[PDB]
Design a protein around this ligand. Structure first.
Ligand SMILES: Nc1ncnc2c1ncn2[C@@H]1O[C@H](COP(=O)(O)OP(=O)(O)O)[C@@H](O)[C@H]1O
Ligand SMILES: Nc1ncnc2c1ncn2[C@@H]1O[C@H](COP(=O)(O)OP(=O)(O)O)[C@@H](O)[C@H]1O
Ligand SMILES: Nc1ncnc2c1ncn2[C@@H]1O[C@H](COP(=O)(O)OP(=O)(O)O)[C@@H](O)[C@H]1O
Ligand SMILES: [Mg+2]
Ligand SMILES: [Mg+2]
Ligand SMILES: [Mg+2]
Lengths: 487, 487, 487
């Protein structure tokens, strides 16, 4: 009863189990990286280059691996991009870790020295991260463009980065954070990808409750009701219906029900209304228009109304919805994504989510670094010298940790097709205490260039979060020498 | 019907079953000790170095072993640390016990002399335990730091011991005990471990009930309602809502429901409120702010309000919670634990629980001893001489009890990789009636040092509780000669 | 249809099935006797030296044996100690009985002569039982100490016997019996066995119903309510709450519910209260404090209040309970048992139950005899001479009944390790019409001593009850010649 793995078996089991989910996403890394198509047991397909979703949505069973998935799962949570790289490095730390274990270094010494180097690399980044203005709306767009590439250069549509930057800039809650949930993302087919647009307002999946109501209003004034406009059979409802026309509202969104008598009295007045709107769609409307959620229909002031420069019922991609667009001061915004087929749309969307993360991350943080595997080769040589000022075995650990980070430049080369080993040498010479700190491999060029100038940039949060969660988890894995599997 | 084990078979069965769950945690002992990863039948993993949880959360079936798990289960209950050592010694008393049984010593003679020595070692410790001031806030931190190490030297973050000491010192109930439950422990991801912090107040997993309410208040005055703020459809609620503004409260935590009419009247007043807060979260708030749990909304005095220097709704690690931080005189406190992944966080937490135990134990007790296996080698040689002043066989027992305790120094060496046998001799010479009583093996040094000075200290409760529950249970096991297993 | 045993087969079946559950507890007899660990089908373990529980809690199926368990089950019921010896003798009467049956003595002659000797030994004991004072508090403690030994000499803690004697002396219902149920036995972990103490009052597994109430009161006055203190929403409860403050009661134990309005009015007054207390805990409190169970809250007189010199809420072993200790004139008492692990506690408890029995038995009876197998060797030689004054076969029976009783001295020797046969001769010479009647084997000494002087004493009820239930049941077994087993 029933399965147990001892010592060098249990370590090899885990270190291997780790390297394997790592090697499973190695191939998506970079712009010249490939996508995984991922059916389940229901013929349900899902195609993506996004690291974490790949990991999440596959049946991974082995307990060691279950925990590298932890790393990716919290990278996405605390950044948005760089989920693959956090997992990939975590694998490469386990790889280098067994080169020392098979040299009879004690696990606790390895994990000591890994910690030591994770510590260093954290303040070593702090210092090699350029500062940026929270509204440097030009740099914000080089960041959002560097994010979309890597999901393929061909998604890197210029006028799409711009849309995103603008749309994250809108929902900034002074001060001074970005609520990644204030940007609503909607997907509807069309003949598009290029037709994706910013809607400064809200998209509601309802329709005017009475066909007799207006199907367009401009410069409308919006009344949001958390109440339920009842009726009966004796017009107890000309009250409720004329108290709303009393505030000046030509549009009304109700979360509860609107009885059939108070549907005719609204149509009769010229007021458009929708019943049973999602509670989530009610807060979306509360914020984007500048409105107020009223529970008491009597207490409906004339300043609890929002303002949108258009409220219209359209048929878009077959379905008919209520657009509340062209708002004045949006604290909620909608990204309307569009593409010919459904999974084409769904992956453009995962790309936008990664953008909106790294953009939110720059605004929030203020510091950024240079992509292309740049600040890994930097961060790795610096770590390599810090490594000499270390007496004892734990030194080997620290060099291994330093060599580990070179896995990002390395695999970025691989997928592009280039000769990983050479390119790594060129990029390692160009960091020799002089410049560049920004010297990295351009997988299109083919040769090493200046990434800060080619516009290849990434929030600092991407490499810090990634390097520490990769450290912390592999550290714990290495401490393990016995496993106890049942069933 | 069905299975029975006789005499030397039943004893060998139990003594063996015992030594086996003992040998199952031998490997976690000390800083250079390893962790067990522990899946169940649901792919559910849990990694830990904490003795008892390891034992608890594995399907141990054999009845003998079920009872060494008793020892660990009460060690954790009455101390917090030293669960592995209580079990480990318990095993080693069973090991030495059969060396006498296989020499035809009567079980009742063994158990007589084991009792005799357990008796002695109890007053032998009393005398070799240094005194300490309940607020010797320096020593308290050497104690909380000796605890976290042993779960790996790498968790031994200096500024984490300090946080814990401070936080256990706060919740001291004059006089004069520590309620290990007054320190709330919360876990939320972040890019951290280092980001774990002390919050002098409470963390509430709720959110302002009306979006229109303030989302920050400073120097707030807090009204806790054990009542239910009802409504209907005729503002019977401007009463309830203005009776609360009557006491001066700009924040309100309600355990029951807050009707939708009395949610609008609060938002209108500037008062923040949360409905249906855990009853446990209500007592946490009662104590930490200095508030009062009121059942009658009418009897809401203006001194039943607590005081916190900030009440804010934040999004931390995705989820949005209500922080009631920076309080004045906390009789409740929150340890916010943080780490990149989840099991990384979860084990830093088990480490903090052990700290909080041994810290609470020093404050409570006032006496401490020297770790590193120090007071075991002391306690063992002293016991060995007490052993000569014993006529009869029961002497053999007492020596075996004395030799038993050397298992802690021994296995601490093992895991470190050092030569157990030698190290035991060095440490045994350094106790020869002269000094040191504090002379123990430093597993980093490699050589025997003065543990009291290296800051390796442990509440007295760790070695007294452990040595006696190890004595009491193995005493009972040895009395057993027949077993009757069914099914 | 289906199984039947005839004549010499059915007798051999039963006489054998009897001797087998007898031989199953032979090993627990005496201080140098061993314990049985006893799992069931649920991994549920239970370790004990207590005869009856061993028998009870094992799946004994055979019908003959089902009935020796009868003997043990009523020994415990009518005495408390000497459950093993009643069963043991019962077995040894069956053993001797078949030596006569295999000599063609008619069953009815055997059972005639066994009855004859059981009759004799009953009045033969009457005369050789020393008298004692119901309050000879010194002898009472030699009795309660002789009881605990035999469950191992190592439980024989001196200051434990004393506690028990005192605690049985308290609950004496003049005149003049001991209600073994007036002494409440509670078990809570601690680092103890030595920490077990007498609490002159009651332990209640509840907690102050309102956190705002006092958590200590001294010299308190206690009001026990068999009523239900209701409420509603209009303070119909300041009535009920101030009628209680009218009698002068600062503590209140309610069996039914205390509504949430009448919980705030009590907290406000300074009165501590607990709702939904066990009905059994209500009678415990009725008697120990000197209180009165009131159903009508109006009829709450100022003399229906008890008196305890402390009522406090403590956390003891994790759980928090309401101690009502240090009472004045207890007619209920609590034995707080403590020990490191749970089964360690549970068997100390079974030891206390046996003590409380034999102590209650001396007080009640007033007569006692000398243990160590002493009055068995006496009782056996006397029976042996009575045996010569018997004409007919029925004489053989009577000698066999006399030889039977020597099984107690014999097995006490066995387990100690001594040579049963010799020791039996020594002890049989020392009874040769001169002294001693008190001459028995000390299993520590190794040689035969004067048991009355060594403080080895046992209520008379132990040897009378035991010798007659052993006689009555084996008498009935022997009368059986056909069995009819189904299924
Ligand atoms: N133009 C570019 N040339 C070379 N590398 C790039 C370029 N743009 C982005 N990258 C790199 O591609 C990587 C992104 O891989 P990706 O497929 O997005 O997975 P993840 O974002 O989780 O690492 C980042 O390391 C970034 O450094
Ligand atoms: N710096 C140190 N050097 C040597 N031993 C240590 C040091 N710090 C703690 N210890 C020892 O490590 C042991 C702790 O083992 P641990 O893994 O914490 O299990 P437990 O705490 O249940 O015994 C204690 O005996 C303590 O004496
Ligand atoms: N100090 C002693 N020396 C020898 N025999 C003893 C001593 N104390 C008690 N006994 C005997 O031990 C027996 C008790 O056995 P025990 O394990 O208590 O089962 P039970 O009490 O049901 O007979 C009693 O016959 C008593 O005569
Ligand atoms: Mg990307
Ligand atoms: Mg520990
Ligand atoms: Mg007994």
């Amino acid at each position: 009863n029933m399965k147990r793995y001892m010592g060098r078996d249990a370590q090899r089991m885990n270190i291997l189990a780790g390297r394997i989910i790592a090697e499973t996403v190695r191939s998506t890394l970079g712009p010249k990286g490939m996508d995984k198509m991922l059916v389940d047991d229901l013929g349900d397909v899902v195609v993506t280059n996004d690291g974490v979703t790949i990991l999440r949505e596959m049946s991974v069973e082995h307990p060691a691996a279950k925990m590298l998935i932890e790393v990716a799962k919290t990278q996405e949570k605390e950044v948005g991009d760089g989920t693959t790289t956090a997992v990939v490095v975590a694998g490469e730390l386990l790889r280098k870790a067994e080169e020392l274990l098979d040299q009879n270094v004690h696990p606790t010494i390895v994990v000591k020295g890994y910690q030591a180097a994770a510590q260093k690399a954290q303040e070593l980044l702090k210092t090699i991260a350029c500062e940026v203005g929270a509204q440097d709306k030009e740099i914000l767009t080089k960041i959002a463009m560097t994010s979309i590439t890597g999901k393929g250069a061909e998604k890197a549509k210029e006028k799409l980065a711009e849309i995103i930057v603008e749309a994250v800039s809108a929902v900034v809650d002074d001060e001074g954070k970005v609520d990644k949930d204030l940007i609503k993302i909607e997907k509807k087919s069309g003949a598009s990808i290029d037709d994706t647009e910013l809607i400064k307002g809200v998209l509601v999946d309802k329709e005017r409750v009475s066909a007799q109501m207006p199907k367009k209003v401009t410069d409308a004034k919006i009344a949001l009701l958390n109440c339920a406009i009842e009726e009966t059979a004796s017009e107890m409802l000309k009250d409720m219906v004329a108290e709303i026309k009393a505030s000046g509202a030509n549009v009304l969104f109700c979360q509860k029900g609107i009885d059939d008598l108070a549907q005719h009295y609204l149509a009769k007045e010229g007021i458009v209304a929708a019943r049973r709107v999602k509670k989530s769609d009610m807060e979306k409307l509360a914020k984007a228009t500048g409105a107020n959620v009223i529970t008491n229909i009597k207490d409906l002031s004339a300043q609890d109304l929002g303002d949108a420069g258009l409220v219209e019922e359209r048929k878009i991609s077959g379905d008919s919805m209520i657009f509340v667009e062209e708002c004045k001061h949006p604290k909620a915004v909608t990204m309307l994504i569009r593409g010919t087929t459904e999974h084409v749309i769904e992956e453009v969307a995962r790309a936008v989510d990664d953008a909106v993360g790294v953009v939110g991350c720059t605004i929030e943080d203020g510091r950024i670094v240079s992509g292309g595997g740049s600040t890994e080769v930097e961060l790795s040589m610096k770590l390599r010298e810090y490594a000499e000022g270390i007496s004892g075995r734990e030194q080997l650990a620290v060099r291994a940790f330093a060599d580990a980070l070179e896995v990002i430049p390395r695999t970025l080369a691989e997928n592009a097709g280039l000769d990983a080993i050479e390119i790594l040498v060129k990029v390692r010479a160009a960091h020799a205490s002089n410049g560049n700190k920004c010297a990295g491999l351009n997988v299109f060029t083919g040769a090493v260039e200046d990434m800060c100038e080619n516009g290849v940039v990434e929030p600092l949060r991407v490499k810090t979060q990634a390097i520490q969660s990769a450290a912390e988890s592999t550290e714990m894995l290495l401490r393990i020498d016995d496993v106890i599997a049942a069933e």
